[PDB]
A and B are shown apart, each in its own frame.
With several copies, the nearest count.
Chain A
Amino acid sequence: DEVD
């Protein structure tokens, strides 16, 4: 999971 990664944030934009």
Chain B
Amino acid sequence: SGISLDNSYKMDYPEMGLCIIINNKNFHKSTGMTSRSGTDVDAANLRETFRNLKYEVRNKNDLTREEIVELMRDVSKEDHSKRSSFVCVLLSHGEEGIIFGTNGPVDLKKIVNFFRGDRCRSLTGKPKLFIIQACRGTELDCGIETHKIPVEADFLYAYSTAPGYYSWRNSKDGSWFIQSLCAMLKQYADKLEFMHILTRVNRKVATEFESFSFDATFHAKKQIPCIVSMLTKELYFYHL
């Protein structure tokens, strides 16, 4: 044949892959965690969005920390040979490095380790995307007026917010991040590379959103998401 390049992930396997959405809305009383109003808007948006990208979407609601770990374990032990990629979406309370089951926390590193290059072989070399709508701390942004491959390779963490910061969720419209994510995937998934889509998501969140609160502490605050990429190639959701 003629000259061949290689800087984009192969996305023309028979299946695009799984999209696991963990939607945690109601939390055991003993945890002391509030209900996450509007998260169902988010779960439903994501479901539709990723359906249109031809992912096999599985929605899960209100999982204990035990259920989260066993679900991720089981999904990682499936044969993904015919799938191009893996996507997992976490919607819950959180803190830096941490996501909450309905009855207590889960180390994010525990969840993602299941999918390490050496531990999930049918996903080695393929993009593993973790999209996390959850707090990474309690800081507020007050804004300003304007072997042979690493086992950690081929991961992408699309964080809703900067390290150390709260993440904002609107109980009517859904979270700022997920709203913006789905809109940008809708409009640009058939033409832009994923990092450039996520960059549009950064700008949308940074520019179009600002908290309104009766509490001065939480009023007029801003948010910037955080793209953490360990990808080794460009990711286009379409192929030719």
- Give 11 new A-B contacts, CB below 8 A, not counting A1-B211, A4-B92: A1-B212, A1-B218, A2-B168, A2-B169, A2-B170, A2-B171, A3-B135, A3-B218, A4-B133, A4-B169, A4-B175
* Interface size range of chain B in the complex: 20 to 34
Q: Is the interface of B mostly helix, strand, loop or mixed?
A: loop
B135 touches A4 (CB 8 A): yes
Q: In the assembled complex, how far is the CB of residue B145 from the closest CB belonging to chain A, in whole angstroms?
A: 19
| Interfacial chain A residues near B160, Cβ < 8 Å | 4
Top 10 nearest A-B pairs (CB, nearest first) are A3-B166, A1-B211, A4-B135, A4-B167, A4-B134, A4-B169, A2-B169, A1-B170, A4-B93, A1-B212
Docked Cα-Cα span, A4 to B218, in Å, equals: 13
Within the complex, what minimum Cβ distance (angstroms) separates A4 from chain B? 5
Set of chain A residues within 8 Å of B94, measured between Cβ atoms:
4
Interface check B36, CB cutoff 8 A: yes
How many angstroms from the CA of A2 to the CA of B33 in the assembled complex? 13
Query: Which residues of B does A touch, CB under 8 Å?
Result: 34, 36-38, 92-94, 133-135, 160, 166-171, 175, 211-213, 218
Residue of A nearest to B160 (CB): A4
Interface residues of A (CB under 8 A from B): 1-4
Question: Could you say which of B166, B211, B212, B213 contacts A4, with CB atoms under 8 Å apart?
Answer: B166
Give the residues in chain A near B213, CB-CB below 8 Å.
1
CA–CA, A1 and B38, complex, Å = 10
The answer to whether B37 touches A2, judged by C-beta atoms less than 8 angstroms apart, is yes
**Which of B37, B38, B168 is in CB contact (< 8 Å) with A3?**
B168
Q: Which residues of B contact A1 (CB under 8 A)?
A: 168-170, 211-213, 218
Q: List B contacts of A3 (CB < 8 A).
A: 135, 166-169, 218
| Nearest opposing residue in chain A for B140, CB measure | A3
Shortest B48–chain A CB gap in Å is: 22
| Inter-chain contacts of B218 with A (CB < 8 A) | 1, 3
